[PDB]
From a paper:
The spike (S) glycoprotein of SARS-CoV-2 mediates receptor recognition and viral entry into cells. It forms homotrimers protruding from the virus surface and, once engaged with the host-cell receptor–human ACE2, undergoes a substantial structural rearrangement to fuse the viral membrane with the host-cell membrane. A large number of SARS-CoV-2 neutralizing monoclonal antibodies bind S protein, especially its receptor-binding domain (RBD), providing a basis for vaccine development.
We determined four cryo-EM maps of the Beta S trimer engaged with ACE2, including Beta S-ACE2-C1 (only RBD-1 up), S-ACE2-C2a (RBD-1 and RBD-2 up), S-ACE2-C2b (RBD-1 and RBD-3 up), and S-ACE2-C3 (all three RBDs up), at 4.0-, 3.7-, 3.6-, and 3.6-Å resolution, respectively. Overall, the pattern of these structures is similar to that observed in the Kappa S-ACE2 complex. In the S-ACE2-C2a, -C2b, and -C3 maps for both the Beta and the Kappa variants, the up RBD-2 or RBD-3 appear also to associate with ACE2 if we lower the map rendering threshold, indicating a dynamic on/off of ACE2 association with these RBDs, in line with our BLI data showing relatively rapid disassociation kinetics between ACE2 and the S trimers (koff = 1.00 × 10−2 s−1/9.34 × 10−3 s−1 for the Beta and Kappa S trimer, respectively). Similar to Kappa variant, ACE2 binding to Beta S also induces a pronounced S-trimer population shift, facilitating the transformation of the S-ACE2 complex to the more open C2a/C2b (64.0%) or fully open C3 (27.7%) states, beneficial for the shedding of S1 and subsequent transformation toward the postfusion state. Transformation to the fusion-prone C2a/C2b and C3 states can lead to loss of concealment for the S2 central helixes, which was offered by the RBDs resting above them, and decrease in S1/S2 interaction, facilitating the shedding of S1 and transformation to the postfusion state.
Residue numbers in the entry:
A (entry chain B): 641 to 676, 689 to 729
B (entry chain B): 924 to 1161
C (entry chain D): 730 to 827, 848 to 1068
């Protein structure tokens, strides 16, 4: 469990090549998360699910359905 | 009705199960709590002197040696209190900045309708519900978001008599056979008419224009009544 | 964002001194308040990148077959042939913004690396560029909706009061005006390197603050000598505690002055980050009708660009 990066030597964590959504940040693009017989793993942060929208001259997408979403924002005063 | 009532019910389930959503307000109380605790703990430090109790310094050391030792705590506790005031002035600029940002959301999102993008929250803003919170305010934002979509075939213009026709409101769509005019935010198929489009330019100045037949709502009404005019004057000549 | 710095009270004031370490315990928790203040700054500086650079949670890409209607986006779009993802405009943005770091780390000043690296910043920018070119204003307020780019400017003109018939007739004229305007950006950034001085001043204020913080250690502050080995190895233990106390009091005020100065600059960088984050949603993601907000003229579309310790906005307006 010895791994080095730009943030320095990190002991007690396993290196994973896959990229998921983590919790405990580290730095220099390397993060940390508790995942599966479970331990702490360190891996490069994931940038989100890749969605490639098709583009064409005559192609257009008009939504046929809608939804009503309610969000909560807490601003201190 | 089922979309709004179910969304409000999820608020009670989110606030009860997750207590960290209000952490924005808990950080204000915890910040002032750590500032008051540290400010008191500085009273027990000697500050390079013999003792931290000024009553013991006066009751033991001589008057000439006491004024030097007592001055060490007075100077130290003064700098420790200036540090507290300095932190409070800095934290005041943070809480007043969030208050000015909240005062703007009360006017634009709640009182009126704000067309700003992602100011009232993600999606197209509709109506905002203010709520009371300790040392703060909670905002409930009702927004309009699309759900499902379908790929359509569009055209920049419709060519009929040789003059280009452009949509007044909405965009052109097609299922592969008929060309319809629908809104961008919602799909409402409508027959292309002279009332929904306007004539500008010609067909040669538009790149990608397609040929179609623009239905004139005045055409069949006048023609059917024109046949009443032809048959009437037919009796005039008979 | 600004450079993340961390300063320890023990090594900065008096290092390798056991007697001075006990004298520091007499002044209480002052280390805790100075360490948590500098730590809180490094956390808020990372939050500025999450509220500005990070906007949409989905990664958008450009189609292989590109017909934009005469526009050339190769300047704003990143170059896949390079080992790191960046565009032609971001080439001049990074090169015109200016070891000193290693020398400051020798005196006990720790420079923490940022959580969000430079490679991920350009990906967030490329995701917002590829989305605006394709999905237009749809992906910001909801699910991504594919729309022809020629139909996108038609709605952007109808929002400012211009009938879309102007676009189809002037499409050849607008193609030359836009491509020539983007070409002036590369000529302005290469010839004039002072347009980015707003970001260079942020680095200069940090360089002057870190260097002056170290230069205060060479001053004696009214004591016998600034070197710890000079006082401890000469004067008696009762006499040395008085002279070292003069070094502690002086170096503590110089350290509290730096922390107080950085907390003030931390409030200034968050004010500009909130102003930049507001332009991300209104000018870039959507279309803002505000006057002199997205820039002079009637706003149409905004193209964000990655920059070191900042962000560059490219606004397209109707004049």
């Amino acid at each position: 469990n010895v791994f080095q990066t730009r943030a320095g030597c990190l002991i007690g964590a396993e290196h994973v090549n896959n990229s998921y959504e983590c919790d405990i940040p580290i730095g220099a693009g390397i993060c940390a998360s508790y995942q599966t017989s479970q331990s702490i793993i360190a891996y490069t942060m994931s940038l989100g699910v890749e969605n490639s929208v098709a583009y064409s001259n005559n192609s257009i997408a008009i939504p046929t359905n809608f939804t009503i979403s309610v969000t909560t924002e807490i601003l201190p005063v | 009705a089922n979309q709004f009532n179910s969304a409000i019910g999820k608020i009670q389930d989110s606030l009860s199960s997750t207590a960290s959503a209000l952490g924005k307000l808990q950080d204000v109380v915890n910040q002032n709590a750590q500032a008051l605790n540290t400010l008191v703990k500085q009273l027990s430090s000697n500050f390079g002197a013999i003792s931290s109790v000024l009553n013991d310094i006066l009751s033991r050391l001589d008057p000439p040696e006491a004024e030097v030792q007592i001055d060490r705590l007075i100077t130290g506790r003064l700098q420790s209190l200036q540090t507290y005031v300095t932190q409070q002035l800095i934290r005041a600029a943070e809480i007043r900045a969030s208050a000015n940002l909240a005062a703007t959301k009360m006017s634009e999102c709640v009182l009126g309708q704000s067309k700003r993008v992602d100011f009232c929250g993600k999606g197209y803003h509709l109506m905002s519900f203010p709520q009371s919170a300790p040392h703060g305010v909670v905002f409930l934002h009702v927004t309009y978001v699309p759900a499902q979509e379908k790929n359509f075939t569009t055209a920049p213009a419709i060519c009929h008599d040789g003059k280009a026709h452009f949509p007044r409101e909405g965009v052109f769509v097609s299922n592969g056979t008929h060309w319809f005019v629908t809104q961008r935010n919602f799909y409402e198929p409508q027959i292309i008419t002279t009332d929904n489009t306007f004539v500008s330019g010609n067909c040669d100045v538009v790149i990608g224009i397609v040929n179609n037949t623009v239905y004139d709502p005045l055409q069949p009404e006048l023609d059917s009544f024109k046949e009443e005019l032809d048959k009437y004057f037919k009796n005039h000549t008979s | 964002s600004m450079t993340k710095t961390s300063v320890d009270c023990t090594m900065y004031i008096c290092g390798d001194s056991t007697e001075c370490s006990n004298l520091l315990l007499q002044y209480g928790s002052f280390c805790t308040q100075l360490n948590r203040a500098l730590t809180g700054i490094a956390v808020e500086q990372d939050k500025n990148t999450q509220e500005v650079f990070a906007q949409v949670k989905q990664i958008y890409k450009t189609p292989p077959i590109k017909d934009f209607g005469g526009f050339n986006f190769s300047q704003i779009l990143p170059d896949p042939s390079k080992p790191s993802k960046r565009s032609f405009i971001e080439d001049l943005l990074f090169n015109k913004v200016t070891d000193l770091i290693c020398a400051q780390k020798f005196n006990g000043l720790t420079v923490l690396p940022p959580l969000l690296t430079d490679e991920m910043i350009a990906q967030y920018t490329s995701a917002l560029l590829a989305g605006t070119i394709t999905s237009g204003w749809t992906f910001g307020a909801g699910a991504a909706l594919q729309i022809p780019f020629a139909m996108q400017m038609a709605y952007r003109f109808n929002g400012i009061g211009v009938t879309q018939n102007v676009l189809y007739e002037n499409q050849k004229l607008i193609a030359n005006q836009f491509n020539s305007a983007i070409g002036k950006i590369q000529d302005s950034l290469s010839s004039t390197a002072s347009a980015l001085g707003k970001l260079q001043d942020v680095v200069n204020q940090n360089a002057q603050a870190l260097n002056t913080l170290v230069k205060q250690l060479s001053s004696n502050f009214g004591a016998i000598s600034s070197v710890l080995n000079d006082i401890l190895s000469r004067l008696d233990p009762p006499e040395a505690e008085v002279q070292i106390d003069r070094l502690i009091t002086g170096r503590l005020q110089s350290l509290q002055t730096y922390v107080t100065q950085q907390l003030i600059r931390a409030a200034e960088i968050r004010a500009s980050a909130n102003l930049a984050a507001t332009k991300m949603s209104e000018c870039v993601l959507g279309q803002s009708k505000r006057v002199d907000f997205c820039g002079k003229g009637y706003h149409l579309m905004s193209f964000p660009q990655s920059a070191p310790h900042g962000v560059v906005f490219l606004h397209v307006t109707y004049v």
